[PDB]
């Protein structure tokens, strides 16, 4: 009736999104941390838990008691983890990237299929207010026949990069890959894929800027979209149907609050502001037209951790499926294979 | 003095966006009207200003008094008929589409250059208020090095566009010229195009949806777009630089004026609704934020007229360029060349 987990890296990714989650659910069980170079005033109140520290690696592999493990360590690391951990005989929850490559994703999904256990990347971002708001909308079918989605990621911060570096380093691949999930885990796996993908500041620089479009024939599109000079924003969600449409401003807020010491089991955590309520517009049935808010979902990463409990202990689908880590893995590095303006059509 | 203008065609086009503007104007005299089947009811009030029909085009274009003429017949037609006009020695304004090919469009600016005598297509649009307002924001510099301008023209008219027809029938020809043309006279010429042109209700029927990016280096880029299910409106025009942005809702309603019985002598006529002026968010260079709104610059397609005078009387620079109008039409043609969504390589 609980499960008793662990975690590869005690980073600060570790630390901002994973266990203030995990710690106020008693439908988990943290026992042992695994850090080569722990911290001692941070694990501090961890130990205090009853949480179990350690720079021995197998000291958690071994033990017999866990059953999960989440690795947020350093991108290069997370592919040689997940493998010695789907091998210890335990489901494995990763961080971006999931792995260096589509070929290796392939290997630890078909390894998770061998030990029978359940592989997964992190995908925490399908629990934003914004995008939870955007997602009911959408299965009501309030708008009817959807033929586009705009979904954002943008900030202000002109000339923050400026240096090179690899496509691992980039935007796409740091906020698209979240973007693209969710929708992804939405609409399914597209027919082809624009991509315009590039540093608007600096030519040779990483990409810190992005417009990709995922096609679904030729009714539909999802665009993902990243800029670091926006000053205006445009909605965090914009949709459109053959009924009417949504439009939504303002994003999740859990990240900015736990940035600000306020925990997850803190009230009012991850409400969204009424100012910033989406809004619907659409024409019934009598062809009457209708305006209201959409009182946006509670925002809730931890509920990824809930996900995880089902499968685990109720068997339920597992909320990631291979399918979509996989499609969404084939498109962000396809996006790399031509130079950027390029098209792309999905393996089929 | 003043120009001696006439017009080859007397329908709905003519009677809507030149008459309506060139009639009050005292530095434009309109003589002659050509037109095979006239209208006695509507050339009664002319008539008795002083203009005078005809069905026969050898008297509009043998006049030598008559410098100036537009062609407002059918789109067919507009390649001979402008010709004839170069021919016969005069300065011609031609309505959209200009000429049936490149090819063709090439060869009037020529002859045009040959007779010596001005050439161009009718366009009226970069006289829009809100186009203006966006314009003069980018001629100040506000917003530092531009990153990116978004241009739309939606409708919601969900099941209007279901039949198939020539390319020239769909929404990027007949509405993309006038986004795109606008764009093309303050950017200039890009370096390549992306286009998603499409129909996301009936695939084959005339298209009915576009998405198009100019992209201009590294840096900047311009998506002119269309679609015909779109109950909330994107804002007109969007731009963001390296120090700010500007956001403007609400499109020029000369239109909407002129189709209520509403003459440009009118008050008030294309002053914008200070709910819609556009407004930018920019920061000085001492850091400061600066919000205000722009008063959105008086929209008046007459001015199209005002330029050809000053080209004519005054010797001054003539509006629409050989390059901006070839350009135009060779990205128009250029997106049907293939398979949407596609890819597109600039010369020059």
Not at 22 to 30: A, C, P, S, W
Request: proline share 5%.
């Amino acid at each position: 009736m609980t499960v008793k987990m662990g975690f590869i890296g005690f980073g600060k990714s570790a630390n901002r999104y994973h266990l203030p989650y995990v710690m106020i659910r008693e439908t988990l069980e943290v026992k042992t941390i695994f850090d080569l170079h722990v911290n001692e005033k941070a694990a501090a109140p961890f130990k205090e838990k009853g949480v179990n520290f350690t720079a021995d690696l197998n000291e958690l592999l071994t033990d017999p008691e866990i059953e999960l493990i989440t690795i947020c360590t350093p991108a290069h690391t997370h592919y040689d983890l997940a493998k010695q951990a789907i091998l210890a005989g335990k489901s494995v929850i990763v961080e971006k990237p999931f792995c260096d490559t589509l070929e290796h994703a392939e290997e630890l999904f078909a390894l998770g299929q061998e030990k029978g256990v359940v592989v997964m990347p992190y995908q925490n971002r399908r629990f934003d207010g914004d995008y939870l708001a955007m997602k009911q909308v959408v299965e009501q079918g309030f708008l009817g026949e959807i033929n586009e989605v705009e979904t954002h990621i943008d900030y202000y911060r002109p000339g923050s990069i400026t240096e090179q570096g690899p496509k691992e380093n980039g935007s796409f691949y740091g906020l698209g890959i979240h973007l693209m999930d969710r929708m992804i885990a939405l609409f399914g796996r597209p027919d082809q894929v624009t991509y315009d993908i590039r540093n608007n500041e600096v030519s040779e620089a990483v990409d810190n800027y992005f417009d990709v479009d995922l096609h679904y024939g030729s009714k539909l599109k999802v665009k993902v979209k990243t800029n670091h000079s926006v000053a205006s924003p445009y909605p965090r969600f914009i949709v459109h149907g053959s009924n009417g449409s949504f439009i939504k401003y303002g994003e999740d807020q859990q990240e900015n609050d736990l940035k600000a010491g306020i925990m997850p089991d803190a009230p009012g955590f991850g409400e969204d502001s009424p100012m910033y309520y989406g809004e619907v517009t659409y024409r019934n049935g009598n062809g009457d037209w209708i305006k209201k808010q959409i009182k946006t979902p509670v925002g809730d990463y931890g509920r990824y951790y809930d996900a995880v409990y089902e499968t685990l202990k109720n068997g339920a689908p597992q909320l990631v499926t291979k399918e979509q880590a996989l499609t969404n893995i084939e498109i962000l590095e396809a996006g790399f294979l031509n130079p950027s303006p390029s098209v792309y059509h999905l393996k089929e």
